[model samples]
Each structure stands twice: as C-alpha cells, then as structure tokens.
Target: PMALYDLTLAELEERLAADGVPRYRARQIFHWAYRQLAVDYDAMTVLPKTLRADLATRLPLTPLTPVREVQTDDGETIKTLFRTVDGQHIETVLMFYPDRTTVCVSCQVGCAVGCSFCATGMMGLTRNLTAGEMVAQVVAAARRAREAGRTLTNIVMMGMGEPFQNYEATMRMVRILHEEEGMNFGARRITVSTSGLVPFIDRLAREPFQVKLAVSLHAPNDDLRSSLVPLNRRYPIGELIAACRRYVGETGRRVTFEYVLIDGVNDSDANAEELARLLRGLLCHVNLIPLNPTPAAPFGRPSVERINRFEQILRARGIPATVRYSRGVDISAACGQLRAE
Candidate 1:
C-alpha cells in the first residue's frame, strides 16, 4: 500500500477509482490530510464508516516514526529525529519567528555532498527519501505549528541532502505540497538550497514553479571552496557562477549565496573582497552565517569583528549581504545535527 503523501491528486483519484470509489474523493482526502490537518482517516467526516477504515488500512500516513525531540528553553526551535521504517534516521527542524514559522525538511537520510563544515555531510549519504517520505516532514511541521497556534510559512530544503542529487522525488514532493487541492503552499515560499550542484542549478530554471534558490557557497575561491565543498572541485567557481547567471537571466529572480564563516578560513577581509568582486554584476544576496560547530568539527565560528567585517565588505562593494546566526544553538538544530549520531 502506498503512503498518503506518496499519491498525487491524479494518482489518488485513479487509485480510489480502482477500489470502486468516486474519483472526487481524492480532493476531500487531500483537504483532510493537508489543509484540515487530520492525523487519521477518522477525522474525514465526509467519508463513510466502511470507506474510512478501509482507506486507513490501504494508505499509511507517513514513513517517519518520531524518535525524539529536542528544543531550546525559549521554545522557539524544535528539532525532531524521525526513524524511518527501515531504521534510517532523518531529522527536520521547526523554528518559530514572530512573523513567520519555518521548517527545514530533510530530503535524504544523510548527505553525499560532504561539505567540510556541515554536520550532515559526515554521515556520507545513507539513502534518498521517497516523495512520500519527504513531504511528510513539511506536513508534520505544519500540523505542529497549527497545534501551537501558528502556521508554517516557509519550507527550506536545506536540512540533510543536496536536494538536486535526489531531484526527481524532491520535485514530486514539491508538487504534492503545492497542490491546490491540498496543501496549496505558494511556490515562492519554498526554497531549494544546493551545495553548488551546477547541472541541477541549470535544470531548476526549467521547473514549473518559481521556487527560490540558495547556493551554499562557503568560499569565494576555487581552492578554498574545493577544500570546503567537494562539489566545487567538480563544477568549479566559474561554471557555477555562469549557471547562476543563466538561471537569473531565465527566471528573473535573485539567487541567495550562503556563506558559512569558518574561524580561520574564508573569513578574512581579502576573502570578503574577493567574494564581493566575484559577485559583481550578479543579482544575488549573501547570507553570511556562522558555522555551527559539531562535536568533532574541524573548523570553528568566526570572531565578532571578522563576522561583522565580512558583511560590511559585501555591502560596501554594493553586494546585498546579511549576517544570519543559526537558531536553536542550545538544542543543536543546525541542519542534521540531531540525527548525526
């Protein structure tokens, strides 16, 4: 039996028809599962008693079994560790802001990118989640946010995997999450972050929705970047920038460059100057975030002066830049920190 989130509206319509049920029931099911936040089929009042029990048996709600939850004392950030049926551990983060509540959803059990600064990369790619498995994270976040009297406003695909590496299922999950008959989330609110997967960056431009793109560009130079991000060596800085420019030219959207400032590496004034020069004519913003330290991470966060100076240099050079500190510091909510164990 397929999981509830695994089926598209059309797919579900056909499945119900095969089971001798009306096709339009798919819409009602989606409305209950997504918009109305029904945890079980019992809440779907429109369905008959026999149909509800039968549907429940046929469609599993999710692949994730919540293992544990860790949060800060302020109650703003909650990191949930979910164990898949096959025993792979994946995590999703729910962060609360005054104006927006956002969830960072993982696309893989671990990650293949292996960025030097990331906690998730250390695990070395366990497996890719199915379309159904991926969407469940967002739905769960939305449900939890509702329970807390807030609504999830943003879905950032920066949690575990290089989403483009598992692009097919990721797009399917994107469609299901955005289905008007169901979640109906605005495409603009969903951001797909990649670790400079150049080919996929080019392909995302041709996708149906206007999903935002954020590239994890830890270093400005190829040498430094290759040391930080393995993909950089393969694609190189020149090719990645060219792809970004093409994406901008085609989509008419500004991309965001995510730079994690490591203490002694890629956080100097010269590095910032080089970074500013590198992005000269590009329509983009730089998010200068401090590196979140893992238990055995080789690098550390940049100093106060270094961090401020880096952002200042970018702005002085006419580059849009902002220093965003990672939240849930107390609970280790940075990307895959919770499931790294």
Candidate 2:
C-alpha cells in the first residue's frame, strides 16, 4: 500500500482520478487526515464506506512507526525516534509552550553537512526523508499537542539534517503543512534552517511564500568557520552573507543567524567583535545558542557571562540578538545532538 501522506493534493487528485474516484475526494481526504488528524480511513466518515474500504486497501496513512519516545523538560519537551518503512531511523522533537507548541522536524535520516559540533553529522548522509515522512512527524506532534490541550503553532526544519540539502521534499512538506483546507499552518510560523547553503538560499529568496529563513553561521570568519562547519569552506562567510542579504531583499523578512557559542571557540570577546563586524548593517537577527555538546564533539557550552558578552557586543553594534537556551538536553534532543543507533 502506498502511504497517502506521501502524496500532495495534486498527486492525490490524480490518483483518485485514476482509481475511478472523484478528484474532489482528495480535498476531503486531506481535510480528514491533516485538519482533523485522523489516523484511520474509517474516521473519514464524509466518504462512502466503499471508498473508505478501497482507500484502506490502497493507501496507508503513516509509514513510520515510533520505536522510541523520551520526554524531558518536565514532560513539556518530547522526542520521538521513528523507523521509516525502509528501516532508516530519524528523530523529531516537540516542545510545548504556554502560547504555542513547536515541532522540530527532520528532513533527512542523517546529515551530510558534517558540522564538527553536530552528532548527526558524524553519521553522514543516510537518505532524504519523503515529504510524507516529514508531514507525519508534524501530524504526530499536532495530535499530542491536541491531547494536551495546546495548538501546534510552529515548525522548525532544524532537527536532524540540513533541510536545504533535501530541498524539494522540504518545500513539499512546507506546502503540505500550509494547505488551507488541510493543516492551514501559516507560512510565518515555519522556519527553515540551513547550514549556509548559498545556492539554495538564493532559490528560496525567489519563492512566493514568506517562510522564515535561518542560517547556521557557527563562526565569524572563514578560518574559524571552516573548522566547525565544513560546508563554510565551500560557501564561506562572504558568500553566505550575500545570500542572506538577497534573501532579506527578496522576501522582506529578516533572516536569522544561528551562532552556537562554544567555550574557547567562538565565544571570546575578539570573536564577538568579529561577528558583530561581519553582521553589521545586515537585516538579520543573531540567535546565540549555547553549544549543546555531544559525545562525538569536544565543544563545551560558554558560561552565562560569556554568552551575555557575545550578545551584548552584537546589540552594541546595532544588531538584534538573543541567547536561545537549548531545551531537552536531558533527553539528548537539544540542537546538534540527534543521532540514531
């Protein structure tokens, strides 16, 4: 059986037409599966019993099985390990807040960018997740959020892989989530984070949607950045900054620079000064993330004073910046810490 979650509205419509079913059944099915978070064909009572039976035989809902789930942050943060239909494993994180719930979804089973501070990078490239796999993560998160009486307000493509590397599926996942008759999640509520993929950044700028963009700029200059983010050696700071500028110009949205503060690495006063100089006058906000160290990495998180000084330097230079704490550290769900066995 094909996973129905894998099909877009157009694809579903085509499939329905081929199956001697009305094309509009695609809309009804999308509404039931995404908007209502229905897990079974039987829940789609709007459709006839015969169609539902046919759908049950031909199209499965979610192709992934949750093999493990761990909760942290007093149960406010949950991480799930899903095994794909083909047996590759990926992880997704759900964080609950008072006003909104956010799901950090993975676009690939493993990452290829190979950032030294990231555990998933150590695993190397496995495979890109299908759009259905990506959407399934959100559906599962949304269901849990509903169970706890919260709305899933945001999605971050920042969990296990470089989303831009898996660009097509990632965009399809975004479009699926943003479908009005389905999930109807707003574009602004979604943030796609990239490890400075310059070409994809340029392509994203031309897209019609105004989804938020974040660049993982781990270091201030090429010399230091090349050591942490290996991809920086190819795209470098100058090229990456230019892309961010173009993105801001095209989208009329401020880009975000994610700076992971590692002790004795990129958190010093001189480093902060260099970062401020690098980002000065750019239409971007800096997210100073204290390094979430992993066993495969030797980095350590900067002290509160150090992190504050880095943020202060950016603010002093007229750059908007904030120190974002890593959540779910206890469950190994923090940034740069996702891996599969």
Candidate 3:
C-alpha cells in the first residue's frame, strides 16, 4: 500500500485505472486529499462507494503521528516531535510571525555532512525520508495550524538534513505541497536550503520552477569554508559561487546566502571582505544568523557588533543583507540549533 498523499496526480490516475476504477476519480481524490484536506475516504464523496472502499484498503493517508508537542508559553511557537511507523523521530517547528507562521521540516532522519556546528551530525545518517514522509511533514504542519488558530504561509527545508543530499524526494514533496489542491502553496513561498552542494546547484538551474534557494555559506573563503563545512572541500568557494551565478542566470531567482556567525570563526572583518568580493557581481541576498548555543554544539554566537560589521561589509558593496532574528532558541529549535535525539 502506498500513502495517498505521496502519489502525484498522474501517479494517482494510473492507480485508479489499475484498480478497475475510472481514471477521472483521481481528480476527485486529489481534491479531497489536498484541497479539501480530507483524511477519510468517505469525504471523497464524488467517487462511488465501492471505489472509495477499494481506495480505503489500498491507499492510506500519511497524516503524521504527533507523539509529543511542546508549546511555548508566549503562545507563538509550537514544537512537534513526530514518530514514523518504524519509530524514527523527527521534528517540525511552527513559528508564528505577525503576518504569518513558517513551518520548518526535516529532510532526513539525521545527517551525514558532519558539519562540526550541528548536533544532528553527531547521530550520522540513518536514512533518507520517503517522499510520503516529506509531504506529510508539511501536511502535518497545516493540520497543526488549524488546531492552533493560525495560518501557515512559509515553508523552509532547513530543518535536519542538507536538502540536496536527498534532492529527488525533497523535490517530489515540494511539488505535492505546491499543488493547487490542499495547501495550494506557491513555489515562491517554499525555500530549499543546502550546504553548498555545487553539483546539485548547477543541475537545479535547468528547472523552470521558481522556488527560493539558500546556500549555507558560513565562510567566505575555501580554507575557512572547508574548516566549517566538510562538503566545501569537495566543492570549494570558487566553484560554489560559479554555480550560484549560473543558477541565477537560468532561474532569475536571487539566491540567498546564509551565514551563521560563530565566535572568533568566520566572523572577522577580513572574512567579510572576502564575502563581499565573492558575491560582488552575483545577484543574491545575504542573511546573517547569529549562532545560537545548543547543548551539543561547540561554537558560540558572535557578538552583536561583529555581526553588524559583517552585514555592513556586504551592504557597502551594494549587496542586499538582512539579519535573521533567532527564534525558538529557548527550545533549541532555532537555525543551526535543531538536533534529533
């Protein structure tokens, strides 16, 4: 049996035909599962009883099981710990902004890139999430919003794993979430963040879609980047910038450069200059995230003054830059603070 939410419209159409049902039923099913947010087959009223019954047995919903939820007293943030059938645990956080709530979903069970700054890397890679699991996370977030009396507007793939490392499944999930049925989210509202995976960055340029892309560029030079991001050794700073330029040339989307300011590391004036030089002619925005301390993390956030100077360097060179306010820090769910234990 396959999770109904995981199947694309074409895939579902084929399934309806295979089950001796009319192919048109796939559209009704898609509307019910996505647009109408129906979990039970009975809600698919446009379909005949027998066909709905058959689908009930053959296709199951992928609503995630929220085993544990931690709600902050401020009444703006909710952290959910979900359990798969196999008992693997992953986390998704919903943060309420004045205008909208952003949902952050993990791409992999743990991590393998071995970024010395993250705790998820300590567990190593367990397994890639199935396409169903990936979409379920977004669907689950939508369900959570209904219960919390809020609306979900933004989705970020910066939760647990490097999205490009598990690119195919992630893309499939993005498509389903952006479909006009259930969530009806736009590609522009969804962002897929990566840890400077150069080859995949180059390949993403060929697609005509307009989803936002963010590169984890903690450092400005190859030597410093290698020390911060292990994958940088394979695709150095020079190569990553070249790829970013190509991505912009093809997609016309301004890539966002994510820089986590760690104390005494990649936070100096010199590093900032290098960053300005590397992005001089590139069309991209810079997001400076003040590193937050986690129980398992070794680095500390740089001072406010250091971070401001870093942003000044980019702005002086005519590059757009903004400082992302750290959220869910008390719960260790902020940027570069997520860990699956």
Candidate 4:
C-alpha cells in the first residue's frame, strides 16, 4: 500500500485514470485527504463506495498512531510520540506562540548526526521517513492548532532526523505541506535545519523552492565544531560556511545559523569573535539557543552574562543576530530533545 497524500494532483489524476476511476475522483480524494485531514477511507464520504474499497485495497491513507502524548504544564506545548506502521518510533513537537504556532517535525526515525548534545543519537538512524509520514507530522500539529482555534503558521525541520540526510523525502513534504490545497503554508514560512551537510546544501540551492535554511553551527572553528557536531569533521567549518554563502546567493533568502551555547565549550569571547569573522559579509542571521538541560550529555548552559557577550560580539561585527528563546521547557518539548517508544 502507498500513501496517496504524497502524490501531486497530476500524479493522482494519472493514477486514478489508470485504475479505471473517473478523473474527478482525484479532486474528491484530494479534498477529503488534504482539506478534511481524513486518514481513513471511511471518512472520504464523497468518494464512491467501490472506489473507496478499491483505494483501500490499492492505496492506504492511514497514518502512524500516536503511542503517547506529553503536554507541558503550562499547556502551551505538546510533544507526540508516533509509532510508524513498521513499528519504528519518532517524535514531533508543537509550540504555541502569540504570533504563530510552529511545529518541529522529524524527517527520519532516528538521527545519524550524533551531535554530542542531542537525544536522538542514542537511537541511531533506523530509516528515513516516507514522504507521507513527514507530511503527517505537520498535519497532526496543524490539527491540534485548529482544535485550539488557532492557526499553525510555521514549520521547522529540526526535530530528530538530519533533514538533509532524508533530503528527497523532506523536500517532498515541504512541497505537499505548502500546497494551496493542503496546509497551504508557503515555502517562506518553512525552514529546513541541517547540521552542515555540504553537498545537500548545494543541491537545495539548485532546487527552485525558496524555503528558509537553518544551519546547525554549534561551534565557531573547525576544532571545536568537529567535537560538537560530528558531521563537521567530514565537511569542516570552512566548506560549510562557503556552502551557506552559495545557498544564500542562489535563494536570495537569509540563512539562519543555529548556535547552541554549551557553557564553556564554545561560549567564550574568542570563539564568538571567530564565529562573527566566519559569517562576516554574509546575508545570514545567528540564533543563539541556550543548551537545554540534559543529563545524558556532558554540557553546561552558558550563564546569562555569557550569552550577552556572545550577542555583543556578533552585533559589534555588524552581523545581525539575536538570542532565540524556545518555549515549553517544562516537558522537554523544545527542539532536539524529543524521544519515545
């Protein structure tokens, strides 16, 4: 069985014609699946009974089940642990902001980046998520937002999997989620976060999609970066920054550099100045994220004084930057900390 939601309108029309179904049935299926957000054949009331039966036998619309849910004490954040049909587990987090709600969705079952501070690395990479599964995460969060009478306006591909690792499926989900008929989220509001994947960065530039790019640049130089982000050892700092420049040049969009301030490791003035130097003259922004308290990793959160210093260095160097605060810390629903069975 295949996920019909992943197919574009043209592809769905072609498949319906081949199955001896009327072409208009494609619109019905799309409306029911994309607009109604129905995951079951029974909910597709507009589709003919025989066609639904045939679709059930040929194309499966069912999605992963939420094995467990943890809502933050403040009720502003909810983290869901989903069990894929294959029994592989993954997580996605939804956060409510005053202006807009953002859902952080994973692209893979587990992560291969093995960022020393990440929780997904403990599980390793099981498999890349199918295109449908990726889109389902966003749809699920958007459904939750609708329940609260709010709209989900933003999506961040920084939950668990290395998005660039699952590049094709990730990009497909971006397209489907941005479709006017579905969630209708424009590409500009969607950001795909990568941990310095050089070749994939170049590939994304070639694609016409103008979605934002957020690079996980935890450390300033190659030595410290190699220790914090394992992928940097292969691509290194220089190559990654160059690729970011190329991406910004091609997309005409500012790339966001995600800097996780991990106490003394990379939060000193020297390191901050080096980071400013690396990003000088680039059309980009630096988002300073404090390291979420995690016992599994040997890291310390920088004091407020240190974060202020880091911010000063960038601004002083004429790089537009700010410290980004993530909500919902009570339940570990922030980015990069979600895990489940």
Candidate 5:
C-alpha cells in the first residue's frame, strides 16, 4: 500500500478523483490529517465509513513504526526511535522552551558525512529518507507537543544526517509542510543544517524557499576542520566561507555557524580568534555547542572555563555567539548522540 503522506494535495486530489471519489474529499482528508493531526482512518470522523475503510486498505497514513520513545526533563525533552517499513532506523527529538517548541528531524537513515564525533556518522550512509518519511517525523513531534498544550513552533533538520546530502527530498519535505493547504508551517521557522556541502549551499541560496541555513563549521582552519568534519577535505574552509558569503548576499539571511567544543581540540583561544577572523565581516552568528560524547566517539567536552573563554574570545572580537547546550542528555537524545542505543 502507498502512503497518503507520499503525495501532495494536488496528487491526492487527482488520485482520489480517478478512483471515483469527489475531488473535494482530498481537502477534507487533508483537513483531518493536517489540522487534526490524525493518522488513523478511524479518527477521521467526517469521512464516510466506506471511504475511510477503502483509504485504510489502499493508502496507509505514515511509513514509520515506533521502536522506542524516551522522555526527560519532566517531558520537556523527548526522543523517539522509529523503524522504517524496510527496517531502517532513524531518530528525532522534540524540545520545549519558553519561547518556542522545536523538532529535530532526520533526513537519512545514517549520515554519510562521517564527522569524527557524530554517532550517526559511525554507521556510514544507509539511504535517503523520502519526503513523506521526513514529514511523518514532524507530525509525530507535533502531536506530542499538542498533548503538552504547546504548538510546535520550529523545525531543525539537524538530527542523524546531513540534509544537503539528501537535498531534493529534504527540500520537498519543507515544501510539503509549508503548503497552505496542509500543515501551513512558516518557512522562516525551519532551519536546514549542513556539514560544508558547498555546492548545495550555493543551490539553497538560489532555491525559492525562505528557510534559514545553519552550517556545522566546527573549526576555522582546514587542518583542524578536516580532522573533525571530513567533508572539509573536499570543500575546504575558504570555499565554504565563500559559499556562505554568497548565500548571505543573495538571500540577505544571516547564517548560523555551529561549532562544537571538544576539550583541547578546537576550544583554544587562538582557534576562536581565527574563527572570529574568518567570519569577521560576514553576516553570521555562532552557536558554541559543547560536545556530547557517544560510545562510538572518543571526544570529550571542554571544561566550563574553557568553553566560556572560547565564547568570550569571539564576543570580544565583535562576533555574536551563544553557548548552546544539548537537552535530553540523560536519555541520550542530545546532539551527536542519536545512535545512543
């Protein structure tokens, strides 16, 4: 059976009309699916019994099967592990803050970037997730947020994979969610994170979406960066920065540079200064994340003093930076810990 989520509103309308169902039924079905967040046919009370049953047999609602779910911080942070129909594993996280609630969605079964400290990178590339698979993740997280009386306000394509590696499907997911007839999610609220995929970064600048961009620039120098994020070997720091500059100039959107502090590795004052220098005139901000260790990775988090010193160096150089901490640490849902199981 095909998944209803695999098709857009127009496709769904065409398919239903060909099946002798009214075209207006497609919007009603979407209203129930997207507005009510109902994946089960039984929950669609407005539909006729025969149509509901037929739909259940022909087009399943979602493709993800629940494997396990864990919650921490009094339900403020939740992580879910899901198995695909073909038996691939992917993970996503839902986090709640006073200002906003966000979901981190995975775009691939496993990451191909193979960043040294990332848990997902240890598995190598398995497969790219269909756009429907990505949407199912957001629907699950949004349902959970609804239960807690908070609406999901944002999405971060920052879990388990390099989104640019799965470029077309990743952007298609964004387009589907941004569809006014469906979820009606705002484009500016979604953030697509990448690990120095210079070509895709250039492509995203030209794409017609207003979604934000975040680059995992773990280091400012190529020597240190190539060791942390292997993608730097191909794209390198200079070319990547040039791409970021072009992105900012084309879209006028400020970029976010994600830097993970791993002990004495890239947290040195000089490294921070070099990073500040690299981004001196660029329209960008830095998210100084402390490394979260995983069994497959031997990286260690920098000391609190060292972390503070690193941020101070950047701020002193007139660069905006914030110390970002990972949530669901006890449940292994934090950054770079997706393969925690």
Candidate 6:
C-alpha cells in the first residue's frame, strides 16, 4: 500500500477518479485527514464504507514511525526521532511558549553543508527528504500539540539539514502547509532558514508566497565565515550580502541574519563592530545565538557579558539586533545540533 500522505489534493482527486470514485470524495477525505487530523481511514465516517475500506487497503495514512522521543521544560519542549520508510533517521522539535507553539521540521535526513560546529553535518549527507516526509513531521508535531491543548502557531525549517540544499522539496512542503484545505498555516507564520545558498536565496525572492527568510551568517567577514560555514567558500560574503539585498528589494521583507556566538570565536567586540558595519543599512535584523553545546563541537557558549557587548555594538551602530534564547537546548533542539542518533 502506498502512503496517502505522499499525494497532493489534485493527485488524490485524479487517483480517486481513476478508481471510479467521485472527485468530491477526495475533498471529504482531505477534510478528515487535514482538517480533522484523522490518521486512520476508519475514522473518516463521512465516507461510504466501501470507499473507506478501499482507501485503507490501498493507501496507508502515514509512513513515519517514532523511534525515540525526548522532552524537557516540563514537556513544553519535545524532540522526536522518526524513522522513514527506508530506515533513515530524522528529528523534529516542538517548542511551547505562552503565546504560541512552534514546530521545527527537518528537510533532509542529514546535512550536506559541513559547518564545523554542526552535528548534523558531521554525519554527512544522507539524502533529501521527500515532500511528504517533511509534511509528516509537522503533522506529527501538530497532533502532539493538540493533544496537550495547544494550537501549533508556527513552523521553522531550521532543523537537521540546510533547507536550500533541498530547495524543491523544501518549497513544496512550505506550499503544502500553506494550502487552504489542509493545515492553512499562515505564510507569515512560516520561516525558512538557509546556510547562505546564494542562488536559492535569489529564487526564493521571486516566489509569490511571503514566507520569511533567515540566513545563517555566523561571521561578518569571509575569513571567519569560511571557517564556520563551508558554503561561504563557494559564495563569499560579498556575494551573499548582495543576494540578501536583492531578496529584500524583491520581497519587501526584512531578512534576518542568524549569528551563533561562540566564546572567543565570533563574539568579540571587534567582531561585533565589523558585523555592524557590514549590515549597517540593510533591511535586516541580527539574531545573536549563544552557541548550543554539542559533543561534536569544541566551542563554548559566550558569557552573558560578551553576548551583551556584541548586541550593544550592533545597536550602537544603528543595526537592529537581539540575543535569541534557543529553546529545547537540553534536548538538543538548537540549530546545527540535531542528529537523530
């Protein structure tokens, strides 16, 4: 049996028509599957008995199996390891806050960008996740959040892999989540983070959807950035910054630069001043992230004083910046730290 989650609504309608079922039946199934969050054919009571039975026999609802689960912060933050049909492992994180609950979904089983600080990259590239696999992660998180009486308010494509490296599947999953018949997740509520894939950044600027964009710019200059993010070697800081400018010009959305603050690495006042000058007039914000410790990485998190000085330098130079406190750190939910193992 094929996993039903693999098919889009249009594909489902076509499949049903070929099977001698009416097109309207597809809509009903979508209502149960997407709107009601039903994962079993037996629960789609609006459908005829024969049709439901046929669906159950031909199209299984899910292809993901939970392999491991870890939680912290009184179950407010949960990390789940899921095994795909082929047995490749991926992780998804759900974080609960007073106002909103957000899910961090992975786009690939492992990452291709070998950023020295990242654990996922240490595993090397496995393969890009199918669009269905990406969707399943979000649905799984949403289901869990609902069980705890919270609505899933946002999605961040900043887990496991470099989303832009898996560009098509990544954007496809974004569009699927934004579909009206399904989750109807607001475009503004979704954010896609990239490790400075210049061409894809330019492509994302032209897409009709207004999904937010974030660039993982760990350092301000080419010398330091090349050491932290390997992709910078191909597309240097000059090229990356130009792409960001073009993206903002086209989309009218302020791009966000994600900076990981590693003590004595990229958190010094001199580094901060150079970063401020680099992003001085750009329509963007800086997110200063204290390095989340991982066994694979040797760096330590910057002290509160160092972090404050960095942020102060940026704001002093007229650049908007904030120190982002990453959630689920205890559960390995921060950027570059996710490895299903």
Output the TM-score of candidate 2: 0.97
lDDT of 6 by residue, 1-341 (tens): 35777777888899999999999888788778878888688899998899888887888777788888889968889999999889889999999989999999998889888998889999989998988888889889988999989989999998999889898988787777777888888888989999998999999999887889999999989999999999999999999999999998898899999999998889999999899888877999999998888886788998899999999999999989999988888878777679788
Over 47-101, each residue of candidate 5 has an lDDT whose tens digit, in order, gives 9999999898898888998789889958889999999999888999999999999
Residue range 97-198, candidate 4, lDDT tens digits: 889898988888888888888878767988988888988887788778888888888998988889888999988887776767656778888899999889
Error of 1 at 125 (Å): 0.9
Q: What is each predicted model's overall lDDT from 0 to 1? A: 0.88, 0.89, 0.82, 0.84, 0.91, 0.88
TM-score of each candidate structure, all chains considered together: 0.97, 0.97, 0.94, 0.96, 0.97, 0.96
Backbone clash pairs for candidate 4 read: none
lDDT of 1: 0.88
Per-residue alpha-carbon lDDT of candidate 2 for residues 1-341, written as tens digits (9 for 90 to 100): 46888777888999999989999999999999988999789999999999999888888888888888889849999999999988899999999888889999999989998998899999999888889899999999999889888989999999999898899988888887778878988888999999998999999998776789999998888999999899987898999998888878787889998999999988899998888888878888999999887986677887899899889988998989999998999999999889975
User: CA shift at 334, candidate 4, in angstroms?
Assistant: 1.5
Q: What TM-score does candidate 6 get on C-alpha atoms? A: 0.96
User: What ranges in model 5 sit over 4 Å off?
Assistant: none
Q: What is candidate 1's CA lDDT for residue 38?
A: 80
Better of 2 and 4 by lDDT: 2
| Residue runs of model 1 more than 4 Å from their true location after superposition | none
lDDT of 3 at 265: 92
lDDT minimum window of 10 residues, candidate 6:
1-10
Candidate 2 Cα outliers beyond 4 Å, as residue runs: none
